[PDB]
Amino acid sequence: SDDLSFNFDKFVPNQKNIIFQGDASVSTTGVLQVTKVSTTTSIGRALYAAPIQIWDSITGKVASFATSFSFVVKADKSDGVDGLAFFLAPANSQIPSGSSAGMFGLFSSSDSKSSNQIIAVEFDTYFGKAYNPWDPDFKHIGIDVNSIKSIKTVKWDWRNGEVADVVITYRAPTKSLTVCLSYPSDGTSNIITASVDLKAILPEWVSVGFSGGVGNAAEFETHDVLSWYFTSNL
Amino acid sequence: SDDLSFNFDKFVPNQKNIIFQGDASVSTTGVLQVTKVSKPTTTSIGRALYAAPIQIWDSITGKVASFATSFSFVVKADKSDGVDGLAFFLAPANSQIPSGSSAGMFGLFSSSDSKSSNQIIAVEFDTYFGKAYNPWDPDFKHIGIDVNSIKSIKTVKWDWRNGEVADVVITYRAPTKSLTVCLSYPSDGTSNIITASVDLKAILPEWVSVGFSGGVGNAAEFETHDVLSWYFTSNL
Amino acid sequence: SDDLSFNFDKFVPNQKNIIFQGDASVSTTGVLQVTKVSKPTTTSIGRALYAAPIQIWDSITGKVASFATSFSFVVKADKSDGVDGLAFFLAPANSQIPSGSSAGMFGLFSSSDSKSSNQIIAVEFDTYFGKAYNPWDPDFKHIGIDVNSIKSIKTVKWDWRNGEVADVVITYRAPTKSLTVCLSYPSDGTSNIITASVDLKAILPEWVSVGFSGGVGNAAEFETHDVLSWYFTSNL
Amino acid sequence: SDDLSFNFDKFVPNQKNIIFQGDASVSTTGVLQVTKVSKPTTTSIGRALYAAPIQIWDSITGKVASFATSFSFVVKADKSDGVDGLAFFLAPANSQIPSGSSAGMFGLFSSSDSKSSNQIIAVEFDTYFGKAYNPWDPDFKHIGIDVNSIKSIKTVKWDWRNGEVADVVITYRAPTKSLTVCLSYPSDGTSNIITASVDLKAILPEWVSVGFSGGVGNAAEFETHDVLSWYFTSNL
Numbered sequence A: 001s002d003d004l005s006f007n008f009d010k011f012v013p014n015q016k017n018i019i020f021q022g023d024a025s026v027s028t029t030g031v032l033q034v035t036k037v038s039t040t041t042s043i044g045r046a047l048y049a050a051p052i053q054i055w056d057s058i059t060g061k062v063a064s065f066a067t068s069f070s071f072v073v074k075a076d077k078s079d080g081v082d083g084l085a086f087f088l089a090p091a092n093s094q095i096p097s098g099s100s101a102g103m104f105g106l107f108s109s110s111d112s113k114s115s116n117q118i119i120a121v122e123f124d125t126y127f128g129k130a131y132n133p134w135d136p137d138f139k140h141i142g143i144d145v146n147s148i149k150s151i152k153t154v155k156w157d158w159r160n161g162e163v164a165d166v167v168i169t170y171r172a173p174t175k176s177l178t179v180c181l182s183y184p185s186d187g188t189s190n191i192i193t194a195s196v197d198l199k200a201i202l203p204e205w206v207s208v209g210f211s212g213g214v215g216n217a218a219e220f221e222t223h224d225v226l227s228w229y230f231t232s233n234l
Numbered sequence B, C, D: 001s002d003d004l005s006f007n008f009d010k011f012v013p014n015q016k017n018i019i020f021q022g023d024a025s026v027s028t029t030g031v032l033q034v035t036k037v038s039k040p041t042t043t044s045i046g047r048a049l050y051a052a053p054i055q056i057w058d059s060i061t062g063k064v065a066s067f068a069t070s071f072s073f074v075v076k077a078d079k080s081d082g083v084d085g086l087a088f089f090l091a092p093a094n095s096q097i098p099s100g101s102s103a104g105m106f107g108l109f110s111s112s113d114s115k116s117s118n119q120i121i122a123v124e125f126d127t128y129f130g131k132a133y134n135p136w137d138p139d140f141k142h143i144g145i146d147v148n149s150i151k152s153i154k155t156v157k158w159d160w161r162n163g164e165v166a167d168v169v170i171t172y173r174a175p176t177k178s179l180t181v182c183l184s185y186p187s188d189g190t191s192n193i194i195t196a197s198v199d200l201k202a203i204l205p206e207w208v209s210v211g212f213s214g215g216v217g218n219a220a221e222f223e224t225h226d227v228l229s230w231y232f233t234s235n236l
C-alpha cells in the first residue's frame, strides 16, 4: 500500500487534523474558508496536521504524489484579490513575518531565496503592476519555486462563483508537476506542467495545505475549498 | 473501499487479465502495442480490454459511477507524420471489433453515423485528419470526446510530440457529469486539456469493458501506438 | 498503488464480473448463493470466480504476491446439522469444475489423492465430517487449509453457528509464506483462527482465478452457503 | 476513497509523523522501540502516536467509523519471562501520558478504576499477570480488550513466543460494533483470536489519536516491546 492517502469529502468546524493559521477556518456549511468572510484584509493557511516524507536521504528515493480539490472564488464586484495556493513547505511551517496577501502568506519578500523551501501552485486573481510587479498581465495559474515570481504561468480563465475541480500530479521519475483545472459548469479548462526536483528544493519532511489572501477589503472575494484528496508514495 | 482499482506499472507478454483483439499484443520489453510493429510494416487494427466487466451504473439504485484513469503512451512515427491514432474507451461488456471497421474509426465503429446502439464513449488521440478519408475530423491532430460516433462532440488541438512519452489523466465525476482529459509531455512541458458533459447512464449499459484501441490505415505512414502503463479506478 | 483491489458490498443478479459455475447464482436480495436454495431442496455444487485472472507470482522477477481478502457468509441449516461446506480458493486461471467431482470435495477435486497437478489452494469451512463418506476429515466441523488435496494440511475446530453471519479475513504474507484465517461471529463473539505455511510459487501457476465453491451432497441434510460481501487485494 | 490510510513498512529515526512520548523512539535498524532498550536495563514507559488526529465518529450525521490496522511486533525477554506488555490504543486527540501512571497500566491509566472520563479503548498484549501488583489480571499472559480500565472486559490466553515476530490484524466493524483481534506467529503457526462488542460513540470523543504504548516495570525482568511495521485505515 501507499505511504499516505487521505480524503475529505467535506470539512467540519474545528477539524482536529487540519492546522489553521491566520484567518483560516471552516464554516458551519462544511467549507474551508482559507480567507475570512464577513469585510476585511485577510491572510490564512490550513495544513494537514501530520508531516509527510517527500524524499528519503537514506535511499535517495523521491515521492510521487497526487492531489485533488474543488474550490470556489466568489467576488462581490466583477474582480477580486488576491488568490489561493496549494503548497508544500517545511514541516510545521508558520506564516512568515511581514508576509502580505499578494504572497499568500508564503513569502516575506519577492526575492528567490533557496532557504524558503517552498513549492506552490497559485491561482492568482490579482496581477496589478502597482503591488505585484512580478505577475503577468492576466489572472493566472503559476508554479512557484522558492519565490512568488512563478517559474511558469498560464492564463487562468477564472469564473466568478463557479466551482473548479483541480488535479495536481507529481511524477517523481520524470520530475513532472502537472496542474489540471476544469469548470464542470461550462467546460472551461486550463492546464500547466513544469519540471521540479523536490529533492533539490524541499527538506525530507514537509507539510501540505492551502493558503490565500485578500489584500484590499474593497475588492473582496472568497477563497473556499470544498473537498480535498491527497496521496503520496516513496 | 472503492468498487474497483487496478494498476499495471508494466505489461507482460500474454497477460491473462487483458483481452487482446485484432493485432494488439505486448512486447518482450513490457509495452502494450495496440497496433502491430513489424518492419515490413502493415495496415493494423487492435484493441486491449481489461478482462473483467465493470458496473458503470446501477439500475436498481440509479447510482452512476465516478472513475479515474491514468496511462502513459508513445506514438512514434517513421516520417514526420503518421496514422491513425489511439483511443481509450468504454463499450458494452466483452464487445468485439465491429465488422467492416477501419483504422480511422479505431476499431470502434462500423460507420460514421451516430447510432445510439453503438453504446460507445471514447477519448481519441487522432493523428490523421485528412479530409479525403476522415471528413468528420477538424484540420489538425486532436484529442476528441467521442459519444456513439467517430465525429467527436468536442475536440481540442493536440500538440503531438513524435516519439515522446505522454502522461494522461482522465476523470469522470458522476455528480456533475464531467469528463476531463489531462495530457502532458514531461520532456518539454507541453500540455493539452479538454472537458465535456456526458451522462454515462444515457449512453452506456450497466456493464462495460474498458480499454485501448488504435489503428494504422496506411502502412506507408506508419507510427506506433504503445501504452506503457495503466491505472484505473471506478466507484458507485 | 496495489496491483488489484475490488470490493462488493452486495451482489447483483447476473453480475458480469463474476463467473458462475454449476448451481452458483445471486438472488434478488443481493446475496451470492454458491449452493442452490430451491422449493424442493436438492443435491448441489457451485463455484463463483472473479472474472479476471490474477498474477499471484512472476517468473521473470521471482516475486510472489501478498494478498488479503474479507467476506461475510451465512450457513443456515434446516435441521440442527447440514452438509457439506463452503470454500475460498485459488486455482489455475479460468479453471472449470472437474469431472466426477462431489459436494464433499467442494467442486475442487476429482478424487482424494494429493496430485501436484491439481494446483489448488483453498480454505474450507467444512460442515460434514462423516467418517464413512469423508474419511479424510477430523471428528468435528472445521476450518481447513487445503493444498492440492481435500485432506487438509492443518485444521482447527470450527464453532459453527446456525444461521448466524460470520466475518472472515484471510491474509497471505509472501515474505513469511504465512496464510492466516481469521473468523468471527459478531452476534456472540465466537472466534476461530488458523495459520499455516504455504509457498504459492511452489503450488500455483503464475495466473490464477479466485472465488468461492461449495456443495450439498445430501438434500435431506440441506443448508445454505451464502456469501454476503467480498473484498480482495493482491500485490506483487 | 477512504478517509484515512497510512502504511509504514519500516520506521526512521526521529520520524516527524509519529509523536513520541516517554521513552519511545525508533532505532537505527528502523524499528519502533516503544520501551527503552539499553546496555544496563531500566524501568520504562513509552507511547508513540500518529501525528494527526482521526475522526472516529461524527456528531452531525451520527456516523461511526470502521477501521482496520495491521502491525508486526516482537517481545524479546532476557530470561524466560518479562514485563510488562504492549498495547494498541485509541485515546482523546493529542493525549499525554497520565500523571502517576505505571508500566502495568501501559502509560494509559492513572489508576485501576473504571472512569468514563478516561475515554480509552486499547488492545493489550499483557506479559505480566502477577497477582501482587496486577490483581486485575487473569492467571496467564493474555490479549485483552480494555475499555476505560486496565481491567479488560474480555481476555484470551496469549501463547507468547519469546523473540518471535507476531503479525496482528485488528478490525472494527461499525455496523455490528465488533472489534476482532487476530494474532499469529508465522514461525510455528501459533494463533490467538478474540472478539468483543464495543460502541466507539459511547466511549470515545469524535477526535482521537491512535498508537502504541508499553512498559517495563521491573528492570530485572526486562523484555523489548518493538513494533516492526504498521498499517492503518479508517472510514466514516
Ligand SMILES: CC(=O)N[C@@H]1[C@@H](O)[C@H](O)[C@@H](CO)O[C@H]1O
Binding pocket: A041, A081, A082, A100, A101, A102, A103, A126, A131, A132, A214, A215, A216
Ligand atoms: C501590505 C499589503 O497588504 N499589501 C497588499 C498586497 O499584498 C496585495 O497584493 C494588494 C492587492 O490586493 O493589496 C495590498 O494591500
Ligand SMILES: CC(=O)N[C@@H]1[C@@H](O)[C@H](O)[C@@H](CO)O[C@H]1O
Binding pocket: B083, B084, B102, B103, B104, B105, B128, B133, B134, B216, B217, B218
Ligand atoms: C477502409 C480503410 O482502411 N480506410 C482507411 C481509413 O480508416 C484511414 O483513416 C485512412 C488514413 O490512414 O486510410 C484509409 O485506408
Ligand SMILES: CC(=O)N[C@@H]1[C@@H](O)[C@H](O)[C@@H](CO)O[C@H]1O
Binding pocket: C083, C084, C102, C103, C104, C105, C128, C133, C134, C216, C217, C218
Ligand atoms: C458422490 C457424492 O455425491 N458424494 C457426496 C459427498 O461428496 C458428500 O461429502 C456427502 C455428504 O453430504 O454426500 C455424498 O453423497
Ligand SMILES: *[C@@H]1O[C@H](CO)[C@@H](O)[C@H](O)[C@H]1NC(C)=O
Binding pocket: A095, A096, A097, A098, A107, A108, A109
Ligand atoms: C521573512 O520571514 C522570515 C521567517 O519568518 C524572517 O526571518 C524574516 O526576518 C522575514 N523578513 C522580515 C522583514 O521580517
Ligand SMILES: *[C@@H]1O[C@H](CO)[C@@H](O)[C@H](O)[C@H]1NC(C)=O
Binding pocket: B097, B098, B099, B100, B109, B110, B111
Ligand atoms: C457494423 O458493425 C455491427 C456490429 O458488428 C454489424 O452488425 C454491422 O453489420 C456492421 N456493418 C455495418 C455496415 O453496419
Ligand SMILES: *[C@@H]1O[C@H](CO)[C@@H](O)[C@H](O)[C@H]1NC(C)=O
Binding pocket: C097, C098, C099, C100, C109, C110, C111
Ligand atoms: C478428475 O478431473 C480431471 C479434470 O477434469 C479429469 O481429467 C479426470 O479424468 C477426473 N477424474 C475422473 C475419475 O473423472
Ligand SMILES: *[C@@H]1O[C@H](CO)[C@@H](O)[C@H](O)[C@H]1NC(C)=O
Binding pocket: D097, D098, D099, D100, D109, D110, D111
Ligand atoms: C490520573 O491521570 C489524570 C489524567 O491525566 C489526572 O487528571 C489525574 O490527576 C491523575 N491522578 C493522579 C493521582 O495524579
Ligand SMILES: [Ca+2]
Binding pocket: A082, A083, A102, A124, A125, A126, A127, A132, A135
Ligand atoms: Ca498576485
Ligand SMILES: [Ca+2]
Binding pocket: B084, B085, B104, B126, B127, B128, B129, B130, B134, B137
Ligand atoms: Ca482520424
Ligand SMILES: [Ca+2]
Binding pocket: C084, C085, C104, C126, C127, C128, C129, C130, C134, C137
Ligand atoms: Ca467434509
Ligand SMILES: [Ca+2]
Binding pocket: D084, D085, D104, D126, D127, D128, D129, D130, D134, D137
Ligand atoms: Ca499486566
Ligand SMILES: [Mn+2]
Binding pocket: A122, A124, A134, A135, A136, A140, A142, A148, A150
Ligand atoms: Mn502570480
Ligand SMILES: [Mn+2]
Binding pocket: B124, B126, B136, B137, B138, B142, B144, B150, B152
Ligand atoms: Mn477525430
Ligand SMILES: [Mn+2]
Binding pocket: C124, C126, C136, C137, C138, C142, C144, C150, C152
Ligand atoms: Mn475437511
Ligand SMILES: [Mn+2]
Binding pocket: D124, D126, D136, D137, D138, D142, D144, D150, D152
Ligand atoms: Mn491485563
